[PDB]
Amino acid sequence: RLIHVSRCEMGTSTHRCWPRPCDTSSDEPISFWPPFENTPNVIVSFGMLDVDNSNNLRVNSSADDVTVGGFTLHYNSWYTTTVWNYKLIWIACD
Amino acid sequence: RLIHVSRCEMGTSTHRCWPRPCDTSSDEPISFWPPFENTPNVIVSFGMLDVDNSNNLRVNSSADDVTVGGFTLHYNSWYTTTVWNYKLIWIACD
Amino acid sequence: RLIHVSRCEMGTSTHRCWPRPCDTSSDEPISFWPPFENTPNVIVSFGMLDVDNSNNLRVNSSADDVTVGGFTLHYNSWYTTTVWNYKLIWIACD
Amino acid sequence: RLIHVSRCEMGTSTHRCWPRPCDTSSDEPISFWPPFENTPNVIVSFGMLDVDNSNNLRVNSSADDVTVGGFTLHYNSWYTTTVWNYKLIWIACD
Amino acid sequence: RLIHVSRCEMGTSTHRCWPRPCDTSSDEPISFWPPFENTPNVIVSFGMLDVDNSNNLRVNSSADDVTVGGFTLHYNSWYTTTVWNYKLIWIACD
Amino acid sequence: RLIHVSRCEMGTSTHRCWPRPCDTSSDEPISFWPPFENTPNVIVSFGMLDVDNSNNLRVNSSADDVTVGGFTLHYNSWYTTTVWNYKLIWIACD
Numbered sequence: 001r002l003i004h005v006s007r008c009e010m011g012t013s014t015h016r017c018w019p020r021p022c023d024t025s026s027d028e029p030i031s032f033w034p035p036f037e038n039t040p041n042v043i044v045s046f047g048m049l050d051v052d053n054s055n056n057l058r059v060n061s062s063a064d065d066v067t068v069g070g071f072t073l074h075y076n077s078w079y080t081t082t083v084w085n086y087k088l089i090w091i092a093c094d
Numbered sequence: 095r096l097i098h099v100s101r102c103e104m105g106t107s108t109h110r111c112w113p114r115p116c117d118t119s120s121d122e123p124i125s126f127w128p129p130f131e132n133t134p135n136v137i138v139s140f141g142m143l144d145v146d147n148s149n150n151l152r153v154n155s156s157a158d159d160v161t162v163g164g165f166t167l168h169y170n171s172w173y174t175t176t177v178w179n180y181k182l183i184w185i186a187c188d
Numbered sequence: 189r190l191i192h193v194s195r196c197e198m199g200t201s202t203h204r205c206w207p208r209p210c211d212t213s214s215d216e217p218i219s220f221w222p223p224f225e226n227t228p229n230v231i232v233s234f235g236m237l238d239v240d241n242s243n244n245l246r247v248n249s250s251a252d253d254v255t256v257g258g259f260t261l262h263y264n265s266w267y268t269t270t271v272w273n274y275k276l277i278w279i280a281c282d
Numbered sequence: 283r284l285i286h287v288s289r290c291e292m293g294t295s296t297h298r299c300w301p302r303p304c305d306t307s308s309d310e311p312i313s314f315w316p317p318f319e320n321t322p323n324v325i326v327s328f329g330m331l332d333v334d335n336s337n338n339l340r341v342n343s344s345a346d347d348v349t350v351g352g353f354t355l356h357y358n359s360w361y362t363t364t365v366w367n368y369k370l371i372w373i374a375c376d
Numbered sequence: 377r378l379i380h381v382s383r384c385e386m387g388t389s390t391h392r393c394w395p396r397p398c399d400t401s402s403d404e405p406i407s408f409w410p411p412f413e414n415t416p417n418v419i420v421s422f423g424m425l426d427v428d429n430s431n432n433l434r435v436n437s438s439a440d441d442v443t444v445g446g447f448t449l450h451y452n453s454w455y456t457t458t459v460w461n462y463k464l465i466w467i468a469c470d
Numbered sequence: 471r472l473i474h475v476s477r478c479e480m481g482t483s484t485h486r487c488w489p490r491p492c493d494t495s496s497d498e499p500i501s502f503w504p505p506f507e508n509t510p511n512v513i514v515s516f517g518m519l520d521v522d523n524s525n526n527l528r529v530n531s532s533a534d535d536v537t538v539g540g541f542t543l544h545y546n547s548w549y550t551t552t553v554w555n556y557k558l559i560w561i562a563c564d
């Protein structure tokens with residue numbers, strides 16, 4: 001019979017930048033082992049955050065170039081925002 | 095034999111407001127197709143955030159009215175907070 | 189045949205502290221019923237957040253002591269950060 | 283994702299007739315608990331057989347009235363055949 | 377997590393030959409739709425049989441050339457055996 | 471969520487004896503690798519059979535001592551029955 005089920009993989013990525021401010025952006029190659037059967041959906045959020053109040057809080061994250069074999073874990077702030085630390089979390093399921 | 099398995103669905107919703115401030119709240123209908131066999135659990139977070147530092151950071155998100163066919167993706171700030179941009183992320187599994 | 193499937197459990201934990209500031213840290217024991225077959229991965233993020241702008245934003249969360257039977261849902265801010273309210277979200281899949 | 287899986291149930295039914303000849307036919311109600319999600323297919327054969335050589339060997343079996351709740355395990359010989367003992371086997375899968 | 381599951385397909389094939397003896401052998405192509413993910417095992421037996429006592433009972437059956445797409449349902453008697461009617465049953469699982 | 475699925479294993483076992491009569495009984499250790507998670511059901515039938523017509527046809531088969539690790543594939547004729555060749559088939563599903 002036909003049933004709908006998912007396989008999920010998940011992970012975190014910690015960036016301890018301070019005493020230096022974090023790079024404006026980061027892109028990390030993540031690999032699924034073994035590859036998924038179907039191209040999975042992937043979402044990303046923040047597990048930890050250390051942002052300076054001297055300017056607005058601007059943070060962004062996403063999963064780019066998602067394939068059955070992996071994806072690019074992306075982060076970026078912009079303009080005058082100063083980020084001191086952060087931890088991205090992500091989950092991918094087909 | 096009896097085994098525990100999950101089907102998962104996930105998605106994101108971007109709100110680009112600036113030059114205008116984002117509305118105090120938003121409620122968006124999300125449909126699952128096909129419907130889940132069981133009422134899934136759903137959780138919501140933020141994938142992107144642009145908040146003004148001139149006041150406290152107040153953000154809230156939730157999955158309301160969750161059924162096998164979908165749910166209401168909810169967001170709200172409150173009091174004096176000013177939000178310029180945000181992206182919600184959500185995942186539903188049974 | 190051999191296939192990859194996941195079982196997922198998820199939940200949220202709300203802390204309203206206002207007008208008192210939330211404790212610097214929190215640790216909540218979470219149970220998985222029934223226990224997982226394999227030790228799951230767990231990720232944690234924020235569903236709601238209320239942080240004072242008088243100081244930098246510093247929030248941290250994680251799943252600690254993860255077993256098939258459960259885990260410790262952990263939160264903490266640090267230094268001078270003042271947090272007024274927060275809601276943690278978590279998802280665990282094997 | 284969509285996958286093909288089967289749930290299977292199976293069983294045997296022994297008929298010790300000797301010293302009397304087995305009835306020309308038999309029909310036994312079989313129940314699946316719990317019921318299947320989809321009507322299963324069912325096949326039936328012989329695990330044991332004791333047939334007289336004074337006439338031709340004529341045996342027949344089938345799964346009749348198959349529903350998600352169960353089916354009728356059917357057996358019959360015909361004409362001049364004499365059967366002294368027999369055991370039916372069956373398996374149902376969706 | 378990794379788990380062992382099977383998909384099964386099954387079927388029957390009736391050969392009514394009387395008043396003529398059945399052919400010494402038969403080979404029928406069986407198609408699996410959709411094809412299995414992995415090459416399944418297949419076993420074959422007799423659900424009905426009508427054999428003349430004037431000679432020894434000799435019957436044979438098997439699943440030949442098994443692939444994910446199908447196989448050849450084979451039957452044969454040999455030597456002096458005379459078969460009047462028979463029904464084959466088969467089940468394929470991966 | 472909870473679903474019913476089976477894992478199945480199957481196999482055949484050929485005994486060529488002619489021109490000598492096959493033994494009155496046979497018992498073969500069958501191993502499931504890897505073991506099942508739950509004690510499976512097992513049914514056994516005949517895929518090939520060669521019985522002398524000088525006496526009644528008497529054949530018997532079963533799966534004895536079934537565990538998650540394996541079982542004893544049993545066969546026996548009785549009294550004056552002469553069996554020349556036979557092939558057992560079996561399928562085990564949990």
Ligand SMILES: *[C@@H]1O[C@H](CO)[C@@H](O[C@@H]2O[C@H](CO)[C@@H](O)[C@H](O)[C@H]2NC(C)=O)[C@H](O)[C@H]1NC(C)=O
Nearest residue numbers: 060061062063064065074075076077078142179
């Ligand atoms: C957050 O990161 C995503 C991923 O890189 C950015 O997405 C790009 O957005 C531009 C328009 O702003 C599109 O033209 C590109 O196609 C997107 N690239 C990818 C890889 O999808 C997004 O702009 C970022 N958001 C902010 C505010 O920094």
Ligand SMILES: *[C@@H]1O[C@H](CO)[C@@H](O[C@@H]2O[C@H](CO)[C@@H](O)[C@H](O)[C@H]2NC(C)=O)[C@H](O)[C@H]1NC(C)=O
Nearest residue numbers: 153154155156158159168169170171172236273
């Ligand atoms: C975040 O949004 C949720 C959902 O809109 C709000 O939840 C309500 O909480 C009150 C108690 O404070 C309950 O009595 C209601 O039943 C909840 N509504 C729903 C639909 O569940 C929550 O109050 C909001 N948080 C903030 C800080 O605005």
Ligand SMILES: *[C@@H]1O[C@H](CO)[C@@H](O[C@@H]2O[C@H](CO)[C@@H](O)[C@H](O)[C@H]2NC(C)=O)[C@H](O)[C@H]1NC(C)=O
Nearest residue numbers: 048085247248249250251252253262264265266
């Ligand atoms: C975020 O919380 C995690 C988990 O509570 C903290 O991890 C600890 O880090 C220290 C050293 O930094 C280790 O000695 C501990 O063993 C870690 N605990 C666990 C259970 O992993 C992490 O330091 C916290 N981050 C911040 C900025 O507070």
Ligand SMILES: *[C@@H]1O[C@H](CO)[C@@H](O[C@@H]2O[C@H](CO)[C@@H](O)[C@H](O)[C@H]2NC(C)=O)[C@H](O)[C@H]1NC(C)=O
Nearest residue numbers: 341342343344346347356357358359360424461
């Ligand atoms: C074997 O048993 C099956 C099931 O009772 C018999 O099938 C019936 O066959 C007749 C024609 O011979 C049909 O009219 C009926 O519709 C069939 N019944 C069902 C439930 O399918 C079959 O005839 C038997 N074979 C022998 C040789 O006895």
Ligand SMILES: *[C@@H]1O[C@H](CO)[C@@H](O[C@@H]2O[C@H](CO)[C@@H](O)[C@H](O)[C@H]2NC(C)=O)[C@H](O)[C@H]1NC(C)=O
Nearest residue numbers: 435436437438440441450451452453454518555
């Ligand atoms: C039953 O049919 C099968 C399939 O046609 C026969 O299998 C062959 O058996 C010989 C002798 O053991 C092997 O060398 C061949 O490789 C087999 N061929 C196939 C297609 O597997 C089997 O011999 C038949 N049994 C009888 C008694 O007729």
Ligand SMILES: *[C@@H]1O[C@H](CO)[C@@H](O[C@@H]2O[C@H](CO)[C@@H](O)[C@H](O)[C@H]2NC(C)=O)[C@H](O)[C@H]1NC(C)=O
Nearest residue numbers: 330367529530531532534535544545546547548
């Ligand atoms: C068929 O084989 C089974 C299993 O080997 C035999 O079952 C035995 O039956 C006797 C008498 O009824 C019992 O004392 C034993 O305890 C049974 N053993 C098992 C494993 O259950 C059965 O007798 C055989 N049938 C024929 C006709 O030979």
Ligand SMILES: CC(=O)N[C@@H]1[C@@H](O)[C@@H](O)[C@@H](CO)O[C@@H]1O
Nearest residue numbers: 150152172173206238239240272
């Ligand atoms: C009425 C109202 O919204 N009050 C809010 C309170 O809920 C809390 O957010 C506090 C600290 O930021 O700021 C205000 O007092």
Ligand SMILES: OC[C@H]1O[C@H](O)[C@H](O)[C@@H](O)[C@H]1O
Nearest residue numbers: 338340361394426427428460
């Ligand atoms: O066995 C051969 C032949 O014997 C009788 O004639 C039966 O009526 C037929 O159906 C067939 O079984």
Ligand SMILES: [Cl-]
Nearest residue numbers: 014016048087
């Ligand atoms: Cl840390």
Ligand SMILES: [Cl-]
Nearest residue numbers: 055056080081
């Ligand atoms: Cl700014």
Ligand SMILES: [Cl-]
Nearest residue numbers: 108110142181
């Ligand atoms: Cl954006």
Ligand SMILES: [Cl-]
Nearest residue numbers: 148149150174
């Ligand atoms: Cl404020």
Ligand SMILES: [Cl-]
Nearest residue numbers: 202204236275
């Ligand atoms: Cl709340």
Ligand SMILES: [Cl-]
Nearest residue numbers: 243244268269
């Ligand atoms: Cl500060």
Ligand SMILES: [Cl-]
Nearest residue numbers: 296298330369
């Ligand atoms: Cl018996």
Ligand SMILES: [Cl-]
Nearest residue numbers: 336337338362
């Ligand atoms: Cl006859």
